[PDB]
Design a protein around this nucleic acid. Structure first.
Ligand code: RY8
Ligand code: ADP
Ligand code: ZN
Length: 516
DNA sequence: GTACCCGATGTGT
């Protein structure tokens, strides 16, 4: 149905193009931009799946300028709100916000401006919690609704509705109030990451029963995906070495599971002279802003070692590697966090250090949810299971796994082979370490069993177990994994007399270990 | 037996 929306003959088109050229300073629309903008200006509810950097902002900022009245944009972070409103005001588009960082007097001025006969402000940025606490905001929105000057409700990063609306920031659910208070006002949700289940969840929680859907390919052509086995007490040195070998002059992020993990990573990297800085909620906002500016400018900070708190507002185009020192809580989270790499389209690396012993820590973190119930927990456990299944899948192409998770099917299976420069690890000693480790565990169990049976025989005859078979002979018997006497006599220290005396008890379960 | 342990915002007089 996008053919009807791909038209430059609408009544709003002329003014739209005027603002697009003179106010935004652009020249050509990108993929799905014009269609989504037309659909928005036609009053339709919109759901936009567009990659980061694809141009989501314009899709709601141009209609906000064209439509009469105020467009209310709900954003999850005060940082995102201030950043976007600053960019808009620098572009000379009337926009303002009402968050916890504005003083009461400027808020009163904003309400008075909204109360004027002509509301100059086109974009009003708010948080979900502000909508669920300010009665003054609700009354102002009602005033705007009565004069038909409440344009849009925009949900920027709509996946957050499904990510924290059920158990952390329940106002993201409780904000459904707007659809009851202002049912005729259209809604537009934008996101870069959403599998079909989260898509349906976003649409149901936002009370959007018939949206126009604008989607694109989830493929990230320029990213090479890696997952490596993690040594929990050496991981810092491993990642640091990898960075030094592959990205000595490249900016990067190391995502960590805990605050102490971030501090340990930063300490190691600083101890060997890598400009790495820790970033998590434990730091003050003063220190957080300082480190963020240090990383963005590459001035004394090459790698930032951060928790999931960092990243949502960052638009650095030349991030060449993203390291997850521990596996993330979900595949959606992994896609979003690793996608912070390679916004410029150049080849980048996504390195994930995997252990299930971190899955246990993530399960502990999940069970430590203040407002979690049986269902929300169960959903998080399933997400973690899907992440572990991705980590342990050493057979399927990682791009195919990611695209199947998001429901994109018509994808070329030979992509990783046609363009090997951006190939995942699976498409490139790998599976041999398991073949060696299984044999080593087998010889360990065999040595234990042989030592125990020798101890039993020694207790029977009243001699130390070294006089039946010594340590080295038992170790050599374990390494053989055999049970044929003709080969046992080929082992140094094993004799025919000791065979004729102890063979029934020595072969014992050792004959059952012939499979390795 | 015990230490482990991410992440927002939020006001009319
Ligand atoms: C960093 C990022 N995280 C996400 C992300 C991860 C997981 C979910 C999710 O699974 N949410 C969900 C879905 C359902 S439901 N209705 O689909 O069954 C029910 C319940 C209770 C929850 C919590 C949503 C978003 C995207 S980017
Ligand atoms: N039609 C367009 N043509 C060229 N550049 C554009 C267009 N629309 C937006 N941009 C640019 O893209 C940049 C980022 O857009 P944004 O909407 O933030 O991307 P994302 O959707 O990934 O967040 C902005 O600096 C903007 O100037
Ligand atoms: Zn591949």
């Amino acid at each position: 149905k996008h053919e009807r929306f791909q038209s430059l003959s609408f009544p709003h088109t002329k003014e739209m193009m005027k603002i697009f050229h003179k106010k935004f300073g652009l020249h050509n629309f990108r993929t799905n931009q014009l269609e989504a903008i037309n659909a928005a200006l036609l009053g339709e509810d919109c759901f936009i799946l567009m990659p980061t950097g694809g141009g989501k902002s314009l899709c709601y900022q141009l209609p906000a300028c064209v439509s009469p009245g105020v467009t209310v944009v709900i954003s999850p972070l005060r940082s995102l709100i201030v950043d976007q409103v600053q960019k808009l005001t620098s572009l000379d588009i009337p926009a303002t916000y009402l968050t916890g960082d504005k003083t009461d007097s400027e808020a009163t001025n904003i309400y008075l401006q909204l109360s004027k006969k002509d509301p100059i402000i086109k974009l009003l940025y708010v948080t979900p919690e502000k909508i669920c606490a300010s009665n003054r905001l609700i009354s102002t929105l009602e005033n705007l609704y009565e004069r038909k000057l409440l344009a849009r409700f925009v949900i920027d990063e709509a996946h957050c509705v499904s990510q924290w609306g059920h158990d952390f920031r329940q106002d993201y659910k409780r904000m459904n109030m707007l659809r009851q208070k202002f049912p005729s006002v259209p809604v537009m949700a934008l996101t870069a990451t959403a599998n079909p289940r989260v898509q349906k969840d976003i649409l149901t929680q936002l009370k959007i029963l018939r949206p126009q859907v604008f989607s694109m390919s989830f493929n990230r052509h320029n990213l090479k995906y890696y997952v490596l086995p993690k040594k929990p007490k050496k991981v810092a040195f491993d990642c640091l070495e990898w960075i030094r070998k592959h990205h000595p002059y490249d900016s990067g992020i190391i995502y960590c599971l805990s605050r102490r993990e971030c501090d340990t990573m930063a300490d190691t990297l600083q101890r060997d002279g890598l400009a790495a800085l820790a970033y998590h909620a434990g730091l003050s906002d003063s220190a957080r802003d300082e480190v963020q500016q240090k990383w963005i400018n590459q001035d004394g900070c090459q790698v930032i070692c951060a928790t999931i708190a960092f990243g949502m507002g960052i638009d650095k185009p030349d991030v060449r590697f993203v390291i997850h020192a521990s596996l993330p809580k979900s595949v959606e989270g992994y896609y979003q966090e690793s996608g912070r790499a390679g916004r410029d389209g150049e080849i980048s690396h996504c390195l994930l250090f995997y252990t299930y012993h971190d899955v246990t820590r993530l399960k502990r973190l999940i069970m430590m949810e203040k407002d979690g119930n049986h269902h929300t927990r169960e959903t998080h456990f399933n997400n973690l299971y899907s992440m572990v299944h991705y980590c342990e899948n050493i057979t399927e192409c990682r791009r195919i796994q990611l695209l199947a998770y998001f429901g994109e099917n018509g994808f070329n299976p030979d992509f990783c082979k046609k363009h090997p420069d951006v190939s995942c690890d699976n498409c490139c000693s790998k599976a041999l370490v398991a073949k060696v480790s299984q044999r080593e565990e087998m010889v360990k169990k065999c040595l234990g069993e042989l030592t125990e049976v020798c101890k039993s025989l020694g207790k029977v005859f009243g001699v130390h177990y070294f006089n039946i078979f010594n340590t080295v002979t038992l170790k050599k018997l374990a390494e053989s994994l055999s049970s044929d006497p003709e080969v046992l006599l080929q082992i140094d220290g094993v004799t025919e007399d000791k065979l004729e005396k102890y063979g029934a008890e020595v072969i014992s379960v050792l004959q059952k270990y012939s499979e390795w």
